[PDB]
Amino acid sequence: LRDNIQGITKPAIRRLARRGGVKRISGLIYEETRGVLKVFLENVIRDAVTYTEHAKRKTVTAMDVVYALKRQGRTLYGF
Amino acid sequence: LRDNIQGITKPAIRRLARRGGVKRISGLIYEETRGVLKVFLENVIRDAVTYTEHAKRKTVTAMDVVYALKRQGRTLYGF
Amino acid sequence: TRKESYAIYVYKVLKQVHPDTGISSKAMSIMNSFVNDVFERIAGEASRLAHYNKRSTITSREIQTAVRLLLPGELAKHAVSEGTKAVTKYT
Amino acid sequence: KTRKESYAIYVYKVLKQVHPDTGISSKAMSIMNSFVNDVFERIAGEASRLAHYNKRSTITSREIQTAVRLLLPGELAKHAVSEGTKAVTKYTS
Amino acid sequence: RAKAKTRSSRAGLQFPVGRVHRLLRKGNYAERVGAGAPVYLAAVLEYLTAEILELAGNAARDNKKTRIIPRHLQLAVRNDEELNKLLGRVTIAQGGVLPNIQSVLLP
Amino acid sequence: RAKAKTRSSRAGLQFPVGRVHRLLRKGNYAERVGAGAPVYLAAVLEYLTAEILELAGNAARDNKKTRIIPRHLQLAVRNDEELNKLLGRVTIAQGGVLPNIQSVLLP
Amino acid sequence: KKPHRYRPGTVALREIRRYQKSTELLIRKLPFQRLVREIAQDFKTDLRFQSSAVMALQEASEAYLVALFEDTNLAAIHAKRVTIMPKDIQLARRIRGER
Amino acid sequence: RQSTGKKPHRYRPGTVALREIRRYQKSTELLIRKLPFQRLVREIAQDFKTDLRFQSSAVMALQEASEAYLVALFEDTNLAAIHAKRVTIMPKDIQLARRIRGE
DNA sequence: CCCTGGAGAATCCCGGTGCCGAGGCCGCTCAATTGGTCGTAGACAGCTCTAGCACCGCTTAAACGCACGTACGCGC
């Protein structure tokens, strides 16, 4: 699995900024948003990996991601 | 005790901005900084008041202030 | 197995406050996670409050202090009044 | 009088172990003690949470290892895990 | 063995006092848990639940909806200032954000 | 009985294993505390303390002072990126901040 | 005839109004899932993910990115601009403490 | 109630400001005075509960925490000022920083 | 209008005091250490079965790219 950071396509970032009320979206901010998303995922998924490793499991459940987001002050409801 | 919000003097806010590396300090920053400090104190001192009222004490200790700063993600060391 | 859930109590509270509205599975799951997270927050605050003053017990004053520490504004006072009313009706 | 628990002499001994030519003031000592208390509370709470989420009643060395991987980031966490593993292997020897 | 009456009915409440007490006991939170602590906790949870569901019903009536959808719950949470400050560190799934547009963005 | 050898010397450690175990037992964290958990906690605490004190000693030597002052500890925390991420939400008294100047500030 | 030729900004406002009231997920499910898989491959080669775990990760990432975009837009309006910039994102991360 | 009522130095702005920045950034002592901050603390506390006292060390901890928080807020405000192609901070920058911080 | 030489003032290195907080020492006592003893949570073996991994049709809304110009980013 390589070059999946391009999977977050340009209209996806367009829609994400439109949800946030952005008027104009630059051409250079897509790479920056991809990097920010990569950093956030490399934190949260790594925390969930540690949770799954401690949980004696090889499959990352939604609950482990839930407290992985909770421990960083970003608690998510509904899972 | 009245007009105690002016105890934080204008050169005190100027020196606080100098510690933060602020180049130029506007004349309208002092009232806004006093209001922000008043809001922060009205949160922290109220939390310490609740902490002291819980422990059946009449004066507030530095440990309760440390707890009130710690519960909001602003933990203080040395007290 | 049996899994603990807060669906029916939230449902009857909803029927008490608004009997003309329903709820979905996703809305129920959001409400369950919200009430559980508030449970852990208030219970942990009460546990820390007991640990600060070497208190071996958690009373209603622990929950009231946790509510005033967590809930801001008039919400904390309303919750404290509701808890006091429930305590007086309990005895 | 009343004996209050503190890590003043322990942090002082650590300082003399790693830097045998310097001293430390009481304000810096209290800052280090508060840092030790906060890190101890954070790791203990993380280990208690990890024990609770797996429906387990005890806290083992793996709980502390997961707590220091979750809290400490990166190479600091890897070095902490290595030091903890070395201490566990020395304690059980 | 007399008649089994729940503590929620004696306190005029719908949330379970006994389940809250059991979760406090097995939650390793304290050595002892008082009698009034689960009653106070259940009363606070009941008040918060009633307020959130009432605001969600108001938002659903504003959207011509008679079923509570997580969009309505997100609108109810973010519309109230106290709920927004309390749940500032809260992510809500399938809720979006408020439909607010800045003044300079309008043409 | 036998010699009362401390658990810190048995594990090659300086932080008290027994004090950590006692604080874990009375700290309302778990029903039981394992054997290796206080050793792991003391090892992590000693490594963090040693790294922070070494960085503070280096900062004191840059300032050429013998005694460690809170300015040295604040510089040690803020200079290390790992310590900056670990203690981002930490306020250190009597320490100030980093003496850095923006590029456009200088004339 | 001539085309309608919408001025720049009107379709932006229409999309803002549409997405600010719709709760659908903007990021496609499979590319985000595969990005999650290659990110987790650096930590564990033999790992699996539940569908609801990917759902929770997608929702949390979408909400975090939307909040970051809101802060970026507010900083852009603060900086006499209407176009979001990478330096605005860097400022928003530095103020929030994530940079 | 009963009353009827040769050439001077002339330092340009900015250089002495940077001098003060360098002097106070490497400094350690407290910038805010003790008793005005203490009196403000008592005045704020008297609105919540009367007949309340603060010890010297609690006032010290509150003063240092408030100074650190305001220094971080001023750092973010100056960063937004340079971000907005400016060297002078505005209260709207402070409001923007508070909004981004979530408070 | 720009480059270079001379001097006013905040800042930095250094000699001398000493002093008041830091380092080392005396007990000793209360928390740390040793041994046994069980209830019991936890490590391990076998079943399974329900949800996840991989590939396939397909079709269709989602996405890359090119042409054009006017709101806006940037220089003055």
Residue numbers in the entry:
A (entry chain P), B (entry chain T): 22 to 100
C (entry chain V): 29 to 119
D (entry chain R): 28 to 120
E (entry chain U), F (entry chain Q): 11 to 117
G (entry chain O): 36 to 134
H (entry chain S): 8 to 12, 36 to 133
Question: Could you pull the original sentences from the published paper?
Answer:
In Saccharomyces cerevisiae, cryptic transcription at the coding region is prevented by the activity of Sin3 histone deacetylase (HDAC) complex Rpd3S, which is carried by the transcribing RNA polymerase II (RNAPII) to deacetylate and stabilize chromatin. The five-subunit Rpd3S complex contains a unique subunit Rco1, three core subunits (Rpd3, Sin3, and Ume1) that are shared between the 12-subunit Rpd3L complex, and an Eaf3 subunit that is also a component of the NuA4 histone acetyltransferase (HAT). The overall structure of Rpd3S reveals that the Sin3, Rco1A, and Eaf3A subunits form a large continuous scaffold to hold the Rpd3 deacetylase in position. Rpd3S utilizes the conserved Sin3 basic surface to bind to the nucleosomal DNA positions at SHL + 2, SHL + 5, and SHL + 7, under the conditions involving different H3K36me3–CHD interactions and DNA linker interactions.
To test this hypothesis, we further introduced an acetyl-lysine analog to mimic a previously known Rpd3S target, acetylated H3K9,22,39 by mutating the lysine-9 residue to glutamine (K9Q)26,40 with the aim to lock Rpd3S at a definitive position at SHL + 2. 3D classification and further local refinement of the Rpd3S–NCP187bp/MLA/K9Q complex indeed results in one single SHL + 2 class with the Rpd3S complex at 2.65 Å and NCP at 2.55 Å resolution. We named the 3D classes of Rpd3S–NCP187bp/MLA at the SHL + 2 positions collectively as the H3/H4 deacetylation states of the Rpd3S–NCP complex, and we termed the K9Q-locked class as the H3K9 deacetylation state. The H3K9 deacetylation state obviously represents a snapshot of Rpd3S deacetylating H3K9ac as the introduction of the acetyl-lysine mimic H3K9Q locks the Rpd3S–NCP187bp/MLA/K9Q complex in a single conformation. In the H3K9 deacetylation state, in which the deacetylation activity of Rpd3S was confirmed by the nucleosomal H3K9ac deacetylation assay, the active site of the Rpd3 subunit is occupied by the acetyl-lysine analog H3K9Q, whose C-terminal region lies on a hydrophobic trough formed between the conserved underwound helix of P786/V787/W788/A789 and F795 of Sin3 HIM. The Rpd3 active site is ~58 Å away from the H3K36MLA residue at SHL – 7. Considering a peptide of 17–25 residues could span across this distance, Rpd3S may be able to target the H3 N terminus from this location. Rco1A AIM, which adopts loop conformation in apo Rpd3S, changed to a helical segment at residues R384/Q385/L386/F387 and binds to the phosphodiester backbone of the NCP via R384. Because mutations of Rco1 PHD will likely disrupt the structural integrity of the MRGA-PHDA arm, the ability to bind to the DNA linker is also compromised. Both H3K36MLA tails protrude through the gyres’ minor grooves at SHL – 7 and SHL + 7, fitting into the conserved aromatic pockets of the CHDs from Eaf3A and Eaf3B, which engages the local nucleosomal DNA at cross-gyre manners.
